[PDB]
Every structure is written in C-alpha cells, then in structure tokens.
Design a protein around this ligand. Structure first.
Ligand SMILES: CC(=O)N[C@@H]1[C@@H](O[C@@H]2O[C@@H](C)[C@@H](O)[C@@H](O)[C@@H]2O)[C@H](O[C@@H]2O[C@H](CO)[C@H](O)[C@H](O[C@]3(C(=O)O)C[C@H](O)[C@@H](NC(C)=O)[C@H]([C@H](O)[C@H](O)CO)O3)[C@H]2O)[C@@H](CO)O[C@H]1O
Ligand SMILES: [Ca+2]
Ligand SMILES: [Ca+2]
Ligand SMILES: [Ca+2]
Ligand SMILES: [Ca+2]
Ligand SMILES: [Ca+2]
Ligand SMILES: [Ca+2]
Ligand SMILES: [Ca+2]
Lengths: 193, 197
C-alpha cells in the first residue's frame, strides 16, 4: 500500500528580471514511480500570478517520477516590466507554495518556493569599451559620441538590443534598459585625450 | 617674343560644407601653350589656408595650356569642421587671389575667387521617418527611441554616418551633423498613439 506522498525538490535560488522570460523546474519523485498532479497556490489561496505558467506534460502516467528519472515540471513566465520594486530587496519577491499528489491521493504538505525579481541592471553590468581618443575631454563632438556608443555596444553584445545607450558631453555613458533601470560607465574608462 | 601672360578662368559659385571634401578647377590658357606655375595668395600675401591644396601635375610642360586643352588645376581640401560661421552666415567666406606664369617670365595680374563655406544642415534636408506607434505620446520607452532613431537613419542614408541622431521624451528628433549644426523633426511627424490608431 502506498501511504507516502511525493518528494518535491524546488530550486533554491530563483531570480527573475523584469520583462525577461525566466524558467525553472520542479523535480518530483514518488515511491510508486507516478505523480498525479500538482497545485501552485498562495498557501492554499489563489496563486494570483497570471503571468506564470507551467506544463502539465506527462502528468498522471505510470513511471513518470522515479528516483532515476524524476518528473521535471517546467515553469516559465515574465515578471511585468513595471512591477514595483520596494526599497527593501527582501520583499521584492513572491513567496508561494506547491503541493503534489500521487495516484493513491497521498498529498504532500505545501512546500515553499520564492520567485525573487529584480531590475534589469542587476543582471547587467557592462564591460569597458576600447578607449576613444577625443580632442576635448570636456566637450565630445557628434562623431566622437557616435564612436563611444559604438565602442560600448561592440564590447557589450550581451546587453539587450532594446536598451538605449546615451553619451554625455564629457564621455560619461548611460545604458537605459527596457524597464527603465540604468548602468553608467565613467569617462575614465571611456575616453582619453 | 611672348609678352602676354596666361588667362585664368575661375568658378563663379564655390560652396564648401564644413567637414566635407570639396573640389573645384581653375582653367588656364597661354598664347605660347605652356604655363610654368601658379601662385595662390591673399592679394600677394601668404595664402593662410593650410587646408587648401592643389596639384602641380603637368606644370611647365610644353603644350599643357592651350585654348582647346587648357591647364586644368584641381584645387581641393576640407574646410575644418569647426570653422566659425558668424551670425550673418553670408560672412562665412574667404576671398583669395590666383596668378600664373608662362615659360617666358610673364605673370598674370591677380584675380579673385571666393570660397563660401556653410553648415552641414544647409546641405542636408531630412525626410520624415516611417511613423513609429507608441504607447504614450508624452513618454517614449527606450525601445521606442531606438526604433525612432533607426527609422530616421533608414529614411536618410545620404546623411553623414558621423551625424548623431537623438530622440526626446515626446518623440522630437534632433539630427546633429559632425560640424554641430542641426535639423529637427516634430513629434507629430514621427510618433502616433498606438491605441487610437
Ligand atoms: C588694395 C587691396 O587689395 N587691399 C586688400 C584688402 O581689400 C581692401 O580692404 C577690404 C577691407 C575691403 O574694403 C576691400 O574692398 C578692399 O579692396 C583685403 O581685404 C579683403 O578684401 C576682400 C575683397 O577684395 C574682402 O572684402 C575681404 O573680406 C572677407 C573675404 O571676403 O575674404 C570678408 C569675410 O566675411 C571674411 N571671412 C570671415 C570668416 O570672417 C574674410 C576673412 O577675414 C579673410 O578673407 C581671411 O583672411 O574676409 C577683405 O578682408 C586684404 C586681405 O588681406 O588685403 C589687401 O591687400
Ligand atoms: Ca506515493
Ligand atoms: Ca520520464
Ligand atoms: Ca547581479
Ligand atoms: Ca548593472
Ligand atoms: Ca544611438
Ligand atoms: Ca604668354
Ligand atoms: Ca537642413
């Protein structure tokens, strides 16, 4: 007789960035080798994350959840571009619960998982461009600004194309990400006489 | 004996744009058919334009300067990017003189030519971009600004690659040419509201 619920392994560090699709997996095992279904919730109440989705592939099939081959439930979604980020990082997150049951109806307790979310600049962090030589360190020309923007972009192919790169009069660089967060590169790493 | 100096024809409307290579030609003939050399000056003083250059190709060669085949002297250079243009832009010019020698020692009397220089925006006239549809007309997103800049650049391949295109919060476009002169495109010609369309 199966009297034991499934074991759920949740990822320890789920970190999502505003406007950027994330994915992670739950791994689930049962002694019977079969998991019937799962439920995501807010400690039993509605999940209330309309932008999160998960796959129900291979649910409630014999052998879908063994020690050697666990049930790997793919979860994905996108945190809204304008999700408010509290000054307190510790509350920039959603704490939710998952439970799972086997075909005998043995249900696990509600297990916690946490989706942390962050502004896009927390993901970036740009590399220094090859140095641009200019005539006046205090007043770059249009051509010199075009060259600086190109050198920043060349050295940073990993930044979103949709990010906008601006250059000030003295060669200070601002990168503005789609969610309106920013990075700066100071002139000393950008230009020289 | 040859006592007659060479005859020089000058172009009548020489216009150069700051930062952009220019060229024009003098045409010179002599009754002997041979011109030895020229002098560019400021009415007999030094030229004082170190960016003005010319070719001495075919100088002092028999037959280089006939009525049918004049000596054509290629003059070229680049007016410096930041050559100053005063409040009245008509003042932006240099009047200089040219004369020429034949092989018999006869030199022509100086005649004037005028190099007018102008801002790059006088040359360029930007076409409107294909319209960009935005969420908020008073506050464009970064991708909307990139899209606007791309649309403006795409609509104007003839504008200098070194010109810088910027976009404001409400979609107003500034094109800043390499010599720091500008053109503008008003928001109502660049962006429209997505929902209402
Ligand atoms: C007898 C003789 O040849 N004199 C020469 C000067 O000409 C005489 O003086 C001037 C002030 C005028 O009254 C002339 O009518 C007069 O004959 C000569 O001065 C230069 O004369 C030319 C006309 O021949 C012209 O006026 C010069 O002015 C400009 C120009 O067109 O070159 C006016 C421009 O706006 C200015 N450009 C800028 C950007 O400010 C230029 C510029 O200052 C110089 O060309 C750059 O060196 O001048 C006028 O200056 C004088 C010149 O050295 O030589 C005398 O032998
Ligand atoms: Ca079980
Ligand atoms: Ca399997
Ligand atoms: Ca980080
Ligand atoms: Ca960063
Ligand atoms: Ca740009
Ligand atoms: Ca002669
Ligand atoms: Ca113009």
């Amino acid at each position: 007789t199966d009297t034991t619920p499934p074991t759920i392994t949740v990822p320890s560090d789920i970190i999502a960035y505003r406007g950027e699709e994330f994915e992670f997996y739950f791994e689930i095992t049962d002694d019977s080798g079969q998991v019937k279904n799962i439920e995501l919730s807010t400690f039993g109440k509605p999940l209330g994350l309309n932008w999160l989705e998960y796959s129900e592939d291979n649910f409630n099939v014999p052998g879908n959840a063994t020690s050697d081959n666990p049930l790997r439930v793919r979860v994905h979604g996108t945190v809204p571009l304008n999700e408010p980020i509290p000054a307190d990082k510790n509350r920039a997150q959603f704490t939710r619960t998952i439970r799972a049951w086997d075909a005998a109806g043995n249900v696990s307790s509600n297990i916690t998982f946490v989706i942390k979310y962050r502004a896009q600049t927390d993901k970036y962090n740009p590399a220094d461009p090859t140095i641009t030589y200019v005539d006046r360190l205090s007043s770059l020309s249009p051509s010199e600004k075009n060259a600086v923007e190109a050198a920043v972009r060349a050295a940073n192919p990993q930044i979103p194309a949709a990010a906008r790169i601006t250059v000030s009069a003295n060669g200070t660089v601002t990168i503005t990400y789609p969610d309106s967060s920013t990075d700066t590169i100071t002139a000393n790493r950008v230009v020289k006489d």
